[PDB]
Design a binder for these strands. Structure first.
Ligand SMILES: [Mg+2]
Ligand SMILES: [Zn+2]
Ligand SMILES: [Zn+2]
Ligand SMILES: [Zn+2]
Lengths: 114, 65, 43, 49, 56, 49, 262
RNA sequence: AGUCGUGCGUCUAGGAGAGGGAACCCACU
C-alpha cells in the first residue's frame, strides 16, 4: 500500500544533489562522499580503484539500508593530497580501463566469424 | 493459466517453447528431460519452470464463455 | 447495457422493466464492461 | 508367521493435508501437524470455474 | 505481555514499507520470531508521556 | 532472513513470482420493509436525501 | 593493453569469454551494469478497449510486459520522462495493437507476432517483437474462445531492468573465477575427500592444476574471470556487453561531471 | 492434351458528508 517508488531508486529527487562531500573529523585529511541513487555497482568499483593507489590510505564504502538507494564513501589520503583529486584520478583510470576492455572485446568479436 | 513468459529465477524466455515442448512429448514421444534438453534449457530453473507448469487455461476455456 | 449469461446477447433494458432474458428464460443478466478508457501497467 | 491381513500401503494412513507433505516421516510430527493446518490457508486455484 | 520487558520505548524511523521493523536483539525480550507476529505501536500524546517513556 | 524469515528476489516478484488475484463479492437486496414499499437501485442525486 | 577478452565461444544469444588483467570489483560491476543498467524497450502501458477472455486485464498486461521487444536502436530512443511530450509521443515510445477473437471450434492462440506496430519508427529497427522458436509463432500470450474478443493497445518505453525485470536484456550471466582453489576463497565442504565430493569445474582445464609441493600463494589475486552472457533476444550478447560497458563508463563520467560542477 | 461449366451484390451519408448488537463458526501470534 506504501511501497517505495521504484523509479526513485535511480532517479534524483527534487532538490537533491548527486554527490555530497563533507569533511571527516575522525582522522586528518579524511572526507565523506555521499552518493545518492547509487548501488554497490559503482561504489565497490570506485573503492577498489582507490585502494589500488599507493597514496590513498583508507577507502571504505558503506550502504546504510537497502531501502534507500544511497551509500557513503570514506576516503583518507596522505597529507597534501586532496581526496577529490584522488577520486577524480580513480574515475579516470576506471574510464580508461573500461574503454580498453570495450576495444578489446570489439576487436575479438570482429576477429571471430561467429 | 499460460506458461510464464520468462523464467522467475533468471528471466530466460520460456513461453515460446511450451508448444514445442508439448509437440516433442506427444509427436516424438520423448521423455521430459530429453525434450527439455533439446529445447535448449540447461539451467534447472527453466527446466522446473516448464516441467512444473499446468495448463489451466485450456480447462478454463472448456466452459462456454 | 446488459448481456445474458447463456445467450450473451445485448438487451439494453431500462428501468421498471423485467430483468429476464428475452431470448431464453435465464435471468442472470450479466452487464458488459464499462465504455470508459481503462489502462494497466506490467508493474 | 500368520499375518492374516496386511496394509495396502502404510502411507494411506495420512490424511488429505498430511499426504501433501513430502517425506512426513523424515520430518518431526509437530511440524507435520503445522503443515497440515497451514495447507488449508495456502492460496491457489480451488476450482476451474 | 508475559513479562515486564514486553513493552518498551523505541525511536521511530520512518520507512517506505508496510511492516514494522525492529532490531534483531529486541526479539528475545518480545519473544518474537517474525513468523507472522503482529505487534502494536502506541504514540505518546503529551510531553509528560514522552519524557516518561524516554526515561523510565 | 533471521528468525525463520526469508529473502525473496524482487526481480522474480515483479516477473511473476507468487502473484495473486483476490476476488471479493458484495451482495445487495431490495428487501421490503412493509408492503408497497421497496428499495430502488438508482444513483442518488442529493435531492430529498 | 589493459584488460583483454578471450572469447572461448560465441552464438546468436550466448557468448562465453575470459577477462584477464581485470580486478574482481571491475568484473562484478560490469556484470551488475550488464544485468541491470542496460537500457531496453518493453511494454509499459496497456490500454484495454474490448477484453472478454477468461484471463484478467492485469494478468494479460503483465504477460505482455515481459514480451521481449527489439532494442538495437534503443540509444536513439529517449526516455519519456526526459523529452517534453504530453503522453507517449512517437519520439519516446513504441505503440503496438493487439487484436484477436475466436471462431466456431478453433481456439485462437495469441503470440508475440500478432502485435502490430502502429507508431512511426522513422526507419528505426526498434520495438519489433523477438521471435526465436523454430515454428516462429513467438511467445504465447493467451487463448481466445468463440465470442471472446481481445482488443488492446501497448505502449513500450525506454527503461532499465532496475525499474522492472521486463527490461532485462540478459537472462543468466554466469561468472566464475579461480576454478582450482588457489586463492583459498572457498573452503570446500567435505566428508570423505574434498576433491572427490566436488566435481572439477569445466573451466579447470584452462588453468594449470595446483601442485601440493609449492606453498600457498598469498600474493595471488583474482584474475582470468570466465564470463558467459546469455541474451533473452532483445539485444545480442555482444551488443549486450558493449552497452553494459557504455553504461558503466557513462555513470563514471557523470560522477566526474558532478564532482567538477560541485 | 488444348477446352469448360459453375458463383457474387445491388441507398448511404455546485457544493458537502459519519456510523449495528448478539450468537455461532473458521483461523493467526
Ligand atoms: Mg511466531
Ligand atoms: Zn531460468
Ligand atoms: Zn438468454
Ligand atoms: Zn515523449
Amino acid at each position: 500500500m506504501n511501497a517505495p517508488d521504484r523509479f526513485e531508486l535511480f532517479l534524483l529527487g527534487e532538490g537533491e544533489s548527486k554527490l555530497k562531500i563533507d569533511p571527516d573529523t575522525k582522522a586528518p585529511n579524511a572526507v565523506v562522499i555521499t552518493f545518492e541513487k547509487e548501488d554497490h555497482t559503482l561504489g565497490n568499483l570506485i573503492r577498489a580503484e582507490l585502494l589500488n593507489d599507493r597514496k590513498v590510505l583508507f577507502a571504505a564504502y558503506k550502504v546504510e539500508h537497502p531501502f534507500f538507494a544511497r551509500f557513503k564513501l570514506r576516503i583518507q589520503t596522505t597529507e597534501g593530497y586532496d581526496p577529490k583529486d584522488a577520486l577524480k584520478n580513480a574515475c579516470n583510470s576506471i574510464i580508461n580501463k573500461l574503454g580498453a576492455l570495450k576495444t578489446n572485446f570489439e576487436t575479438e568479436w570482429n576477429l571471430q566469424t561467429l | 493459466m499460460i506458461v510464464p513468459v520468462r523464467c522467475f529465477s533468471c528471466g530466460k524466455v520460456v513461453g515460446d517453447k511450451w508448444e514445442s515442448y508439448l509437440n516433442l512429448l506427444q509427436e516424438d514421444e520423448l521423455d521430459e528431460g530429453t525434450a527439455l534438453s533439446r529445447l535448449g534449457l540447461k539451467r534447472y530453473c527453466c527446466r522446473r519452470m516448464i516441467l512444473t507448469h499446468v495448463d489451466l487455461i485450456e480447462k478454463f476455456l472448456r466452459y462456454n464463455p | 447495457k446488459y448481456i445474458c449469461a447463456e445467450c450473451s446477447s445485448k438487451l439494453s433494458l431500462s428501468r421498471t422493466d423485467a430483468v429476464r432474458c428475452k431470448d431464453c428464460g435465464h435471468r442472470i443478466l450479466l452487464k458488459a464492461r464499462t465504455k470508459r478508457l481503462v489502462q494497466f501497467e506490467a508493474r | 508367521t500368520t499375518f492374516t491381513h496386511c496394509e495396502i500401503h502404510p502411507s494411506m494412513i495420512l490424511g488429505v493435508a498430511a499426504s501433501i507433505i513430502p517425506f512426513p516421516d523424515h520430518n518431526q510430527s509437530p511440524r507435520n501437524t503445522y503443515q497440515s493446518a497451514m495447507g488449508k490457508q495456502a492460496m491457489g486455484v480451488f476450482l476451474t470455474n | 505481555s508475559l513479562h515486564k520487558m514486553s513493552m518498551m520505548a523505541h525511536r521511530v524511523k520512518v520507512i517506505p514499507y508496510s511492516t514494522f521493523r525492529l532490531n534483531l536483539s529486541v526479539t528475545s525480550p518480545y519473544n518474537a520470531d517474525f513468523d507472522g507476529d503482529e505487534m502494536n505501536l502506541h504514540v505518546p500524546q503529551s510531553e509528560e508521556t514522552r519524557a516518561e517513556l524516554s526515561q523510565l | 532472513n533471521q528468525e525463520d524469515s526469508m529473502i525473496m528476489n524482487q526481480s522474480s516478484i515483479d516477473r511473476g513470482l507468487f502473484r495473486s488475484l483476490f476476488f471479493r463479492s458484495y451482495m445487495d437486496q431490495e428487501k421490503k420493509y412493509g408492503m408497497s414499499i421497496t428499495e430502488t437501485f438508482e444513483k442518488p442525486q442529493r435531492t430529498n436525501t | 593493453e589493459g584488460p583483454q577478452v578471450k572469447i572461448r565461444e560465441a552464438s546468436k544469444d550466448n557468448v562465453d569469454f575470459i577477462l584477464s588483467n581485470v580486478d574482481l570489483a571491475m568484473a562484478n560491476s560490469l556484470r551488475r551494469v550488464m544485468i541491470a543498467e542496460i537500457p531496453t524497450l518493453a511494454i509499459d502501458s496497456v490500454e484495454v478497449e474490448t477484453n472478454t477472455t477468461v484471463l484478467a486485464d492485469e494478468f494479460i498486461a503483465h504477460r505482455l510486459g515481459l514480451i521481449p521487444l527489439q532494442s538495437m536502436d534503443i540509444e536513439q530512443l529517449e526516455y519519456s520522462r526526459d523529452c517534453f511530450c504530453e503522453d507517449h509521443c512517437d519520439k519516446c515510445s513504441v505503440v503496438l495493437t493487439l487484436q484477436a477473437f475466436g471462431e466456431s471450434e478453433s481456439t485462437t492462440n495469441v503470440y508475440s507476432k500478432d502485435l502490430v506496430i502502429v507508431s512511426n519508427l522513422m526507419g528505426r529497427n526498434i520495438g519489433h517483437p523477438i521471435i526465436q522458436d523454430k515454428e516462429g509463432n513467438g511467445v504465447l500470450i493467451c487463448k481466445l474462445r468463440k465470442g471472446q474478443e481481445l482488443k488492446l493497445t501497448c505502449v513500450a518505453k525506454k527503461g532499465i531492468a532496475k525499474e522492472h525485470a521486463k527490461w532485462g536484456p540478459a537472462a543468466a550471466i554466469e561468472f566464475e573465477y579461480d576454478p582450482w582453489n588457489k586463492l583459498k576463497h572457498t573452503d570446500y565442504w567435505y566428508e570423505q575427500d574434498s576433491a572427490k565430493e566436488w566435481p572439477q569445474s569445466k573451466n579447470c582445464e584452462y588453468e594449470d592444476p595446483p601442485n601440493e609441493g609449492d606453498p600457498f600463494d598469498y600474493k595471488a589475486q583474482a584474475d582470468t574471470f570466465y564470463m558467459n552472457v546469455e541474451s533473452v533476444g532483445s539485444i545480442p550478447v555482444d551488443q549486450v556487453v558493449v552497452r553494459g560497458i557504455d553504461t558503466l563508463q557513462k555513470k563514471v563520467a557523470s560522477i566526474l561531471l558532478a564532482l567538477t560542477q560541485m
